[PDB]
Every structure is written in C-alpha cells, then in structure tokens.
Design a protein around this nucleic acid. Sequence first.
DNA 1: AGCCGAGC
DNA 2: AGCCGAGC
Lengths: 669, 671
Amino acid sequence: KGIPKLDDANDAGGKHSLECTLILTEGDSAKSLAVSGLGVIGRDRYGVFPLRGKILNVREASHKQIMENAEINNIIKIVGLQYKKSYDDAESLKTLRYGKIMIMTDQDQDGSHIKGLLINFIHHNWPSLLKHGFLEEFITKEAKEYFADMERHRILFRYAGPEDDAAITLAFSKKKIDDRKEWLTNFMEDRRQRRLHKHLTYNDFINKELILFSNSDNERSIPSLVDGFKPGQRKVLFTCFKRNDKREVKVAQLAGSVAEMSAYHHGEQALMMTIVNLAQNFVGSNNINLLQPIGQFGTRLHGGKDAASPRYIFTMLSTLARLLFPAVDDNLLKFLYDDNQRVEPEWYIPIIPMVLINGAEGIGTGWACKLPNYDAREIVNNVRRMLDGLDPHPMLPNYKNFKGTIQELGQNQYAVSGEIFVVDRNTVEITELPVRTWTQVYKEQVLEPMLNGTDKTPALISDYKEYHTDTTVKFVVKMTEEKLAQAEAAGLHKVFKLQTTLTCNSMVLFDHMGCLKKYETVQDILKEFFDLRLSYYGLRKEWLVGMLGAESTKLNNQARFILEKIQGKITIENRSKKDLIQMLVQRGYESDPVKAWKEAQEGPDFNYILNMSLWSLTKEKVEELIKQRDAKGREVNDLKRKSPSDLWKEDLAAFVEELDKVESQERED
Amino acid sequence: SKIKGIPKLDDANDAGGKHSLECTLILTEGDSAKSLAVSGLGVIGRDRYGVFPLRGKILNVREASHKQIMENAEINNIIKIVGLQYKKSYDDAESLKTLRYGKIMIMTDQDQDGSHIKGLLINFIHHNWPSLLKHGFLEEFITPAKEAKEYFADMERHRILFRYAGPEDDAAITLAFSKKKIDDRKEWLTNFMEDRRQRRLHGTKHLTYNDFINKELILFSNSDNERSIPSLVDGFKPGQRKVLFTCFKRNDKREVKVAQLAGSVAEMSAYHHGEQALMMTIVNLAQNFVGSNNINLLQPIGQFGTRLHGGKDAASPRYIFTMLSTLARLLFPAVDDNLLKFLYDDNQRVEPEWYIPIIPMVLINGAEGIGTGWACKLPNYDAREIVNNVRRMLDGLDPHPMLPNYKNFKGTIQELGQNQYAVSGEIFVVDRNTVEITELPVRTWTQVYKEQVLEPMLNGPALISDYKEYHTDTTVKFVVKMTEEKLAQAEAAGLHKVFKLQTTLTCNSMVLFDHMGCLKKYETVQDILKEFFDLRLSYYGLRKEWLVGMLGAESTKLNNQARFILEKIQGKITIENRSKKDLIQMLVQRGYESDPVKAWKEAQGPDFNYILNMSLWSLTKEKVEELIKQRDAKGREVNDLKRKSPSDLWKEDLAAFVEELDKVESQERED
DNA sequence: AGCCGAGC
DNA sequence: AGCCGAGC
Ligand SMILES: COc1cc([C@@H]2c3cc4c(cc3[C@@H](O[C@@H]3O[C@@H]5CO[C@@H](C)O[C@H]5[C@H](O)[C@H]3O)[C@H]3COC(=O)[C@H]23)OCO4)cc(OC)c1O
Ligand SMILES: COc1cc([C@@H]2c3cc4c(cc3[C@@H](O[C@@H]3O[C@@H]5CO[C@@H](C)O[C@H]5[C@H](O)[C@H]3O)[C@H]3COC(=O)[C@H]23)OCO4)cc(OC)c1O
Ligand SMILES: [Mg+2]
Ligand SMILES: [Mg+2]
Ligand SMILES: [Mg+2]
Ligand SMILES: [Mg+2]
Ligand SMILES: [Mg+2]
Ligand SMILES: [Mg+2]
C-alpha cells in the first residue's frame, strides 16, 4: 500500500497470503498484459508489479546501493520480506503477504537474465525460501488466453541441492569471473562441435538457459577483429550503405530504418546511442568517425554526455566510409539471414584494421575488451611495409588531435600526459588534458578542490580562468611563488592530475572464424588482419576477372547483334518470340553472360539484347556501343595485370588522399 | 537571498544582493534554449544574468482559479527566483528593494508559438503587478553554440524592451488573454483576416504592448485557427493533411512504425512543429474504437487505445504501426490529385491546400478543434447515409435530414431540435434486484463511468448493493445489484437518468474554412453538405476534362508508336545507321508528332524519345499485336469517358467505395 | 567509486 | 471542474 505501480492482490496480507502469487513483469507494458489476462477473478489471488529491466545484483553490491535501490525496496515491501530473517519454519511464513513470486519476462535472453537476477536476489538474501518452492515463472486479449491455460505456461523452479547453489554463484558472483570464462569456453566449444556435426532446477536454468544470455552478451558486446564492429554497429553501417543517403538523416529516423532493414531485435533507443557513438569526432572518441555528426553529438567538455536528443540531430556516411569498406568487396562477404530476410554480413573486410583505429571497447560476461586508438596513417604505412615483405614497426596508441604524450611504461601499459607549462612565477597554463579526461570533470574534480580546499585537502591555487574552445582546453592558473615551487618539486603533471595510466591487458576479439581469442599485442591483431585482407584482395581479383569478362562477352554479343542488324545480316521484324530465340541460338549468340556468371557463383536469356532501345541502331549509338565494348576488353586486361597487392595499394592511396582532404577541411572549420 | 530549490535555474551571481536591480532573468523556451543562453553568456554573463527554462505554454493567470495558480510549479518558480510577492505594488524605488532581479528578458523561438509564450508572460506580469510594467520590467531577446556567443556579444542589437504607453496597452493585453473578451477576439481576428485578404488582392529598440499584441501575437492567434480548425472540403487540418499526403506519396504496402512515419511526414511535407504532436495526430487518425472515427483512414496496428480509457491507453508511438486503410484512396482518388493546388515550402512541393473527397469527410469523422476566438465541433455521421444523400442530390431530389451516427454504437441518438441531441446508453431490468448496462452514451469511457458513477453509487447514500464487469475491449457490460425497493425507486425515475446514461449533445459552433480559406459558421450539416456537393460536382467536371485531355494525348502517343512499328516492320521506314539529326528531321517530315503527353502537360526541338526508346522486342510479332491492342483500347477508353457525365463518374466512385466499405466492415466484425 | 557501451 | 486536440 502506497506503491503507485503495484496492483495488489485483494487477499494479499490476510489469511490467504501464502495462496497469493506476485507477478513481477519485465516492463510496465508486460504488467498491463498480465493485468488484462488475470481478468476480474484473478485479482483475488494474484498481484502484478512491473520491473524496470535489469535488477541490481545484490550479491557483492555495497550496503549503501542495496538499501537505496527503490525497485528492490518495493519488492520487499510488497512481499513483506525481512532482511536477515530465516524462513525455515512454517510459523515464520505467516510474515509474508505473498506465498509465491511469478517472474514474467520476454522469452528472449535478456528476459532470462532478469529471471536470474531475481533468482540471485532471493538466493542471496533468503536461501531458505527457495527450498519451499518460492519462485516460479510464466512462459509465453491474447493474454486472457494464456492465463486460462495457466498451468501449461507455469513452470516452477526447484532447488535440488548444492549444485543449484554453485550454479547461481557461478553466474552472479564477482569472485567467479574465471569460472565464467571456463563455463563459457566449454559452452562455445561444444556448439562448434554440434554445429559442424513442469519443474526446472536452478542448475538447469543456469546452465541450459541463462548461459544463452551470457553467450549472447559477448556476441553483442565484443567486437570482431576483422572489421572492428559489434553486430549492432555493423547493422548500422550495412543500413547506411544500402540507403546511400546523399543528405543528412535524423538519427531517430535512421535507427528505425536500421531495425526494419537489418532486423535489429532490441530497443531503438539503444541503436540511437550506438549511432551517436559512431558519429562522435571529439578528442578521445573516434580517430575516424564513419558517420558525420551533424548537430550536437557531444563534446570533450562533457565527454559526449552533452549530446542532444536523437530526434534533433542528423547524420550521414563520412566520405571515408566506402573508401575503407569498398563496395566491390561486398560481393565477397557472407550476408546473414534473419527469417528469410538477408541482413548485414558476418563481417566487413576493411582495407586497414579498423579495430585498431577507433579503439574497440566492450563488456561481456566472463570477458571484456579494451583497445585504445591507433593512428590511421601509421597503420597504412605498416600495411605497406608488410606488402613489401618487411616487418611492421611497433605502434604506440595515438589519438587524433591529442596534443599530449603517450609513453610506453611496459608491455600494454602507457602513461598518457596532458600539457602544463610555467608561464611566470605566479602562473601555470594547462593546454591539454589526458585522453578521456573531460574538461568539465577536470574543472569540478581537480581545479575547484585545488582552489577551495576540501575537508580532507588544503587549497593550492589562488585562482583559475577558462579560455577553452569547443575542441580545445586552456586553463590559466594562479599560485603563490611558494605553492608553485612545491608543485614543481613534486612535479607538475602529477600534482595537477594530468597523467593517467593506460593498461590494455584484455584485448579480446572474435577472430574471422567467430572464435573468441585474446591478443597479447596489437602486432598480432595487425598480422592476423593482414593475412585475411590479403587473401580477400585475391578473392576480389578473381571476382573482378569473372565479372568483367562476363560484361565483356555481354558487350561483344550486343555489338555483334547491332552490327549484323544495321548491315541486314539479321532481321527481327514481325518474327515470333520463339522463332527469334531459336534463330539467335543457331547463330551462336550467348545467353546473358552476366546473369549466367552471377548464377554460376552459387531457357536462353537474350533480353540483354532485345531490351536495347531502337536508338541502339542509330549511327552515334552504334559508335558509342563499339567504344564501350572495346573499353571493357581493355578494362579486363588492365585488371588482370594488377596483383592483389597493387589493388590494395590503389585503395590505400585513394583513402589517404581523402583522409588528408577531410582532416584538412576539419581544421579549417 | 538565495534559491536552493530550483535545479534548472542558473542564478546570476549578483542576484539577491545590492546589485539585484541591475540583474536580468532570462526565461527561455525550453531547456535546450537555456543551454544556448548559458553558452552565449559564457564566463562574463554569469554575474548579471540568470537563466531559467520555461516548459512551453505558461498558465494564463487571468481569471484562473486560485487553486490552479497556487499549485502551478512554473509560476511559483518564477516568483521565487525574482522575489515577487502577490498583492504588492511596486511604485516607489523603496518597493523594488525586495526583488532579486530588476528585469526579465524572454527568449523564445522567433515563431508564432514563441510569441504566444511572450504574451502569456506579459499577461502574467500585467495581471499581478501592473506597476512593474510601468518601470520597464519586461524585455525580449530576439534571434533570426558559436552563433550564441555572437548573439550575446551583440546583445544590444538583439535586445528589445517592452514599453507601456498607456491604457491602450491594457486593452490589448486584456483583449488577448481575458476569457470575457472572446467576442472581441472574433472581431479582432475578423478584421485581421479581412485586411490581409485585401492586401493579397494588391501589392526600433522599444515595442509597446499594444503593438506587440496587434502586430505580433495576432499572428499566433491566426495560425492557431489555421492549424486547429478543419477545412470544410476534406475535413482535415493541415497537419492531418500532411500525414495523408505523405502516406499517399510513400504508398506503403506494409506497416510502418508511427514514430518512423512521423519523421517521414516531417521531412516530406515540411511539417515545422514537434514530431510528438505529429505522432499523436497519427494515433488519432487511426483510432477505430466506438466514439472516435467512423472511417479511420490509417490502420491501427498495435495498441492505439480503447474505449475503456478513451484512447488514453494507446501504447508508445515507438511500439505501434500503421498504414493506409484500403478505403483511403477510394475516398480520395489518386486521379483527382491532378486537380489540387499543391503548396510550396521554400521551393519544396508539399501537401495541397485541400483534398477533394468523394463524400464530405468533414461530417464522417467528427471534425473538432479549438482555435483563438473560435472553436469547431461536429459529431460523426453515417457514411452510407451520406452516400445516399449525395446520390439523391445527383438525381435532383432533396437530401434527407441526417442525425449523428457513430459506428458500432448500440445506443440511441434523438433529435430534440436543431443541432440538439439526447444521446443514451442502454440499461435493462433483468430481474428484481438486477439491472444490466450494455451501452454507454457516445464518448463516455468505460473506466470513467465506473469511477464517477457506479463507484459513488456503491459507496458515497449508496444506491446499489454491488456491480460486476463483463466488458470486452470493444463492448460494455455492467451487471448491477440493488434492493427491490431501491430498484423500484430508481425505476420510478428514469433508469437512464438515475444511472447517468443520457448525455446531451449540442453543436452550435460548426466553424470551418470554406474552399477559399475563409472562416465560416455553418448553421446545419445540410448547409455543409450542399456547399461540399457543389464544389465536388464541379471537380468531377474538372476530372473529366483532365482525363479527356490526358487520355487523348496517350491515344495520340500510342497511334504514333503503333504507326512507327508498323512502318518499320513493313520496310516503309528504316533507322539503321542513320544519324540522330537525320532521323529527327526525317520523322518530322513524315508527320510523326513530338511527344503528345509531354506536349499536353507543358500546355497545362521535337521529342521522339517515346518512340525510339522502345525496345527491339517491339518489332517482334507478339509485341506488334500487343501494341495495336493497347492503341485501340486507349482510343475506346477516351471515347467511353467522353460520353459519360461528371455525375456518372461520381456514381462509379461511390459504388466502388461502398463495396469495399461493406467488405472491410464485415471483416472487422469477424475479427 | 566510477567509467566505458549495448542492453533491459 | 473537465473534455476535446494540435501545439509549447
Ligand atoms: C520507466 O519505464 C521503464 C524503464 C526501463 C529502463 C529504465 C529504468 C530506469 C531509468 C531509465 C530507464 C531507460 O533507460 C534510459 O533510456 C535512455 C534513452 O535515451 C538515451 C539517449 O539514454 C538512455 C539512458 O542511458 C537509459 O538509462 C529505459 C530505456 O529502455 C529501458 O529498458 C530502460 O531510470 C530509473 O530506472 C525499462 C522498462 O521496462 C523494460 C520500463 O517500463
Ligand atoms: C521537460 O522538458 C520540456 C517539456 C515541454 C512540454 C511539457 C511540459 C510539461 C510536461 C510534459 C511536457 C511534454 O508534453 C507531453 O508530450 C507527450 C509526448 O508523447 C505523447 C504521447 O503525449 C504527449 C503529452 O500529451 C504532452 O503533455 C513535452 C512534449 O513537447 C513539449 O513542448 C512539451 O509535464 C510537466 O510539464 C517543453 C519544453 O520546452 C519547449 C521542455 O524543455
Ligand atoms: Mg526483449
Ligand atoms: Mg563493478
Ligand atoms: Mg571507442
Ligand atoms: Mg518553435
Ligand atoms: Mg477553460
Ligand atoms: Mg474525430
């Protein structure tokens, strides 16, 4: 009583309390479906309360965050549970307003994660209730049909023994991370083997059901080594490539298009945030943003948190996008299917390892991935050295427009330093902040405590002024001569918090086979990317030789028919379709060689000839068609004398050319 | 003096101290406008300038209830920020010592709704503290992140001060915002619309409140009518029309998310307002429950709302889908698009001034709106009755009177007199101790009736012993228990009266734009029907003219294509190896005609592309015979149309419409 | 204690 | 004391 989103069972709290079931639903929308499904009679023995999504994991969570969590407090007040209270006996259960909790979620993996978080919540606080069969689930005007069928949709969770304890702990305990790695490692291996060849116990729920979320969590959160993308990001670029927008599109509108075209199965709000992240160009985000930030996508001041609503902002492809992901290689990719609809590919195959450029980052279950940004030109140069058979030079992380320094301290560990300089004996100037330190955060958490002091720290500076621009940082700080001499003695970057450590010891990617792998150096990422991209330039040459040759044979037959027609060697006039096709066969014309070639990759068709306009017989069109035919034959031969390496070099040169123009234009604006 | 309770406020550093009267409080339209202001001020402006966002339209405090005023958080926020006190006079300089700011600078969009917000703020100060306006308390900041810092560095040229000249300023503010001035606003806007039409037949740091009201706010009041009051012709307001124009253009064969459609509408139709209002309009166009639309032109695929909550239970526009009803293009035939006047927004072609439906859609769906000085309310009418009346008028007979009719409504609508109706639900005695309610009067929602009628009957003297609910999504069933004596007493009085199942409906404001865009008051729906009929019959005449011309052009085009094909296959003509110029000149000398369809369109060198673009297939046997058939069919089709009257084509459209109306409505009842 | 981001 | 709906 007093909880606005709760519809309380009429008998809750009275003599029938333990015969009452509380339905916890995923979202308010599921509560309404459950409310209408219960009808009038269901209000006596059933309550309904909505969940806001993922529940707090209370196992290792701090006491402050637990007691301040409103959703869990609501559940506790609704059910009437008491912390630290043992439910072992029958007299103790008279404390409860509800005898059973029924979790009702989507039938998908994220629903399974909420089930497990609720199971985890009860298992941690009152293990004794689960041995009574406290928890059950509901599986799915269509709702009224479910609740009349209720026993068929009702599954009861059973606690069979200590294997149920270990399973819950395996999933939700901070101390089990390494066990989750093994747990999921053994899971992915068995699927590779299988792919190439009522009551529910908590152990079964966790190992047969929740693990599907845990694996799906990694697949959505951990990028591919090949293109550097997660599937949601890859869906975005696939949609933009297919749309080929010449003008800016509202982010919210592009997101809805992505869901339709790529079969994105999650909430669009998440897609909109991904699109925003793909377009951000501020210092510390994307070395090359593949989407253009037209409107306010956020700045280094707030670290992108100041981005405006996706309803007010627009985007389109960067001109660099199709240069890094050439459209011709789409013919080599493997495009996935979602229920008979062809969708985004397994991965794109960019011309450089984009996974290094923009700093792929993500958090899964059992594993996370963090890579810093690397310099596009430096990577191009290493690809060129490798094409010559030379070893690649080592690479330090490099952030576009970052004015500070990044120094290797050790393997995969770096010091990132901003800029500070003594101006006079009273004055220092801060012209850069370490990568991912945001201007407003630095002001509030560093300079303000330095100016005002805190309860635990003395004042240091006597004043500061802010000269920043939208992309740049300038602080001018005043200090007494004494304080500045002390600051120099301890070192200026240290005192002013301008140095941060960058450690990347989890570089975890899916390889080109879709296998999760840990990479110890970026050189190993570069090498694995290089061997794959080189063979795909081989595949591209094979594809171009075939398609260009088919196009050549096509133009040859078209030109031959036109010449024989204008010379009177052949007439189609007033001839039946059958007679014309038969005659074209007897004279040796080929069925459409492009359609034939395109179908070979997986009656005679002369339409490519007979669909030609009557203009084709005129003088200037005859001459134009002969030129096109001869041009295509020269095109075939020009391609055949290029190696895969030459083709790669052409793409690299064209990309660098545009990268210089684009980044030069950026500094102008 | 400090304010700790208003998180969205950025207080001037000197506000509340000795320099208070030298400080400005910038009120912005919305939070993003505040960020533009806070950015434009920068480090320097923080001392003498505060910024606080307004949430949109401000409470109109003139003649508002004391409760609504005291409970209004936005106004209480403004009062607390500035330090104002109700009932206090600010006259002498001593009285100003209690103010944390000496001036308020309003910063809104440079559009009409921004002007409305300016007026509401002016209204708020004028009503409570007229003395403050004599001191020059109010100012505005006009516009046409880096742009913001440019605006504020030039603030002198963007700053305009409101001036109180005298009693005509009071009259102007009262004329705009007083509930007793409705008649004066009608005259105010009548003169405006008239004087503007006359000009269409032909070719300062300070601003007085009188000039603000009469030259600026009046533009919002007029735009408020133009957006809120429907057109007699199609029954649409402009935003609804832009939706239908977009849907016709897209021609979706599959459902579309309403949020996605709204963004598509904004781009395609140049809709200038918030997309959330467009999404609500889209939801409102698709609702089929009892009491909303007799014919919904968009399909409700999702939860669009029910009669339980009166549509307020619609799910989020992000979660629901729509598309055209199959009736939409039958009511608005695509061929008549050629007769419409399409508007332009900055060289982009957008929705027409109105569609011309085959029946008066303004009577079908109950056109409704609230403007300034006028509102419009029409009930729903029955589509087949309207079709029959149109047929009666085509035959020169008199149209039957029409009572309001709501689809699937099981109750009774009785005419008390002209434009006056008693609308009754259904209640029936089952036995002694039991009555049953199977229908509620139109636009009485099931949950509201339970809460406001049956619940007070059950508890607060209690007239009934109990009730139970058998409703479905689309239907209403209440079974009510009471003592014999109480039922007899309730039955002695009206059962419909006791249970509040009768509502009166009066439509004395039927206010629409006529076909010229002139605001008109219509006394009867027969008047509406007759005015629509004359214009629509005229446009069936235009459609026939348009079709005769276009079909005739198409026939000439085919005659030339067939002639060329026949001469080619007979050897009478050869294009082989001939130059383009020689072939153009030769076709001209032989009397082939330049593209007849293009020539006809341009009428509303020679172009033989429509001939020479034909495929080589055209010279084969089957395509020759096909082309000749197509040519003769086209000639017959132009001849068949010439014989028909505009009335015959209207009858054809009505029959096709009714046939699909029958199929669609049958399928609705089976589902 | 809190960020990073694709999810609820 | 509030609905209707196109707007902020
Ligand atoms: C209130 O009703 C429900 C809420 C939810 C949660 C939720 C829960 C919250 C909360 C916020 C949210 C919100 O997340 C926010 O979305 C924002 C959308 O714009 C982008 C820019 O930034 C996002 C925020 O980063 C994110 O935090 C929802 C978005 O979609 C969800 O699943 C989220 O603050 C308080 O608790 C689930 C439900 O059922 C499944 C519900 O019925
Ligand atoms: C908080 O930030 C601002 C809010 C606003 C108002 C507003 C104001 C409100 C309020 C709500 C709203 C909200 O209206 C609601 O939108 C809903 C959108 O979906 C449909 C289904 O139903 C709509 C509601 O019928 C409507 O009531 C806004 C939507 O667009 C506006 O202009 C509205 O509740 C409290 O006061 C203006 C601003 O600056 C211009 C702001 O910065
Ligand atoms: Mg789901
Ligand atoms: Mg943690
Ligand atoms: Mg990144
Ligand atoms: Mg505006
Ligand atoms: Mg009122
Ligand atoms: Mg209506």
